[PDB]
A and B are shown apart, each in its own frame.
With several copies, the nearest count.
Chain A
Amino acid sequence: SAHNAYNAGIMQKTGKAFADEFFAEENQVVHESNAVVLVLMKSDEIDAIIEDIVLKGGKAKNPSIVVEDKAGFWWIKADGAIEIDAAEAGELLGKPFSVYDLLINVSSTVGRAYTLGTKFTITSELMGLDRALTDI
């Protein structure tokens, strides 16, 4: 749910309350996270994918997804993995759309991201170490 919000946890605090937790001793080492962050650049194609793929079928299969509006881009954070099938996006948009066309407006990935077939996947898994990459 709301653990994936941009302003989750410490980010809600201001002033001295923020400082106290920012400098707390337990927060001086990294904490492993199972999340991934996906940034999508705003555009006609992306706004349709967001509303009709990510926020419908996507959130139905991964309820942890949070989408936030950052003016020029969409900020997306979810547990585990996010997957976007370029072939489904093409059907939605009514025009040819390969995985390489989808990447025209995929702007950032915090996670392990890869292309296989028509599918773009960003996953918390350590691809190439824990699970091998494959060909078509």
Chain B
Amino acid sequence: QSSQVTKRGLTDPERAAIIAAAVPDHALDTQRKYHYFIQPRWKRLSEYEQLSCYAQPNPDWIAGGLDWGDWTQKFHGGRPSWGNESTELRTTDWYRHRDPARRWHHPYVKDKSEEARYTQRFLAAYSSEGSIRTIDPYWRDEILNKYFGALLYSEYGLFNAHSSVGRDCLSDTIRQTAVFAALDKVDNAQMIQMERLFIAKLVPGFDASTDVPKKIWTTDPIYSGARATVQEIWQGVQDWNEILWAGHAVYDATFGQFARREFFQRLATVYGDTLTPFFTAQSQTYFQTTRGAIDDLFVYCLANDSEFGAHNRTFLNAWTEHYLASSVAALKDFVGLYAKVEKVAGATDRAGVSEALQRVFGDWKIDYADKIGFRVDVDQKVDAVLAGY
């Protein structure tokens, strides 16, 4: 070949001998813990913290940064590469957030790869089982195909809300939490479309095209409030803390949990749907993993920052009242769907829908509202959405 075949210093006898003579017989320092100076959240430093913390090169005028001086190149007009103007919230140290699941990139894709491959094995077996035969065909073709299909656009919109978050946020552990949350949302949307494409291979004449779902998401009054909220969270604001709080802690925790768990997953287990719970098992696992990290960032840290907690709760309570109102409206439009399903006692009658709403709002009060000092009357919100039943 035209170029030299390079000899390896590890195995070539001549180069290995030269390298051995140059390596000292002793270590030149004894501190072998990578970025030993990171303050650990837990008993000892974790690999997650070692590989993540202080990758972002913030100067000392962004709270917590170790560097100094102005950025080397800014936007036309002077917008800094990163800056305090990106959010209303304040803190003594932006690096303080920890994902309780301690996900750096490798455990995250390791876990999702398990779900990727197992899903395909499950579908091949489900097709061989002929288990589709017991699914109520009205639930299948009317509610599942059309209205579950339309929910993918709520997940997709929440996914896209993170684009500006991924650019604007101010530390490395926060950036990882946000991007992993974003991929899980777009994963949810693709998984819903995967279920529909799967049913299309088993049931002839089942139309898995997105045309009807997109039409319903954009023009069916059942999704009118949901779409309005998602369009506002995504494209109406750029405060990156507002987007994460509004998207995950208010909208997805109320409307999103009701739609995924209380309607589609729960009622699948009254109309004999053995396929849909396999997919909602994933979206609900993704919701709980994301919540752990959202909780740490906002509830554990920012709402209790030694200097700015009360300051921060002021904005969080304001955001919450505005977006909870949008989400209550969204649920009021959505519960109209119950008019299209078979009345089952304790499930799709007024008492069952009221108990489901009491679960979503009662959980939300314990998980989020009580912890930031937000005062909410669960009963009053349940009554407000039942108005649309």
Contact between A and B in the complex (any CB pair below 8 Å): yes
Binding site for B on A (CB under 8 A): 2, 5-8, 11, 66-71, 91-95
Closest to A69 in B: B5
- Whether a CB of chain A sits under 8 angstroms from the CB of B8 is yes
**Is there an interface contact between B6 and A70, defined as CB atoms closer than 8 Å?**
yes
- From B1, B5, B43, give the contact of A5 (CB < 8 A): B1
A70 to B49, CA, bound (A): 34
Min Cβ gap A93→B in Å is 7
A86 to B247, CA, bound (A): 40
User: Chain B's interface: helix, strand, loop or mixed, by majority?
Assistant: loop
Residues of B within 8 A of A93 (CB): 47
Closest to B4 in A: A7
- From B2, B43, B44, B45, give the contact of A68 (CB < 8 A): B2
Min Cβ gap B156→A in Å is 19
Binding site for A on B (CB under 8 A): 1-3, 5-6, 8, 43-50
**Is there an interface contact between A95 and B46, defined as CB atoms closer than 8 Å?**
yes
**Is there an interface contact between A91 and B1, defined as CB atoms closer than 8 Å?**
no
Min Cβ gap B76→A in Å is 29
Min Cβ gap A75→B in Å is 8
Count of A-B contacts with CB under 8 A?
37
A35 to B132, CA, bound (A): 52
Question: Which 10 A-B pairs give the minimum distances between C-beta atoms?
Answer: A5-B2, A7-B2, A94-B47, A6-B3, A68-B1, A94-B46, A71-B6, A91-B44, A95-B47, A7-B3
A68 to B1, CA, bound (A): 6
**Is there an interface contact between B47 and A8, defined as CB atoms closer than 8 Å?**
no
A71 to B48, CA, bound (A): 31
**Is there an interface contact between B8 and A68, defined as CB atoms closer than 8 Å?**
no
**Is there an interface contact between A94 and B44, defined as CB atoms closer than 8 Å?**
yes
Closest to A2 in B: B2
Some 18 contacts from A to B, beta carbons below 8 A apart, are A6-B1, A6-B3, A7-B2, A7-B3, A11-B2, A66-B2, A68-B1, A68-B2, A68-B3, A69-B1, A69-B5, A70-B6, A71-B5, A71-B6, A92-B44, A93-B47, A94-B45, A94-B49
Residues of A within 8 A of B6 (CB): 70-71
Residues of B within 8 A of A6 (CB): 1-3
Closest to A95 in B: B47
Min Cβ gap A23→B in Å is 23
Closest to A12 in B: B2
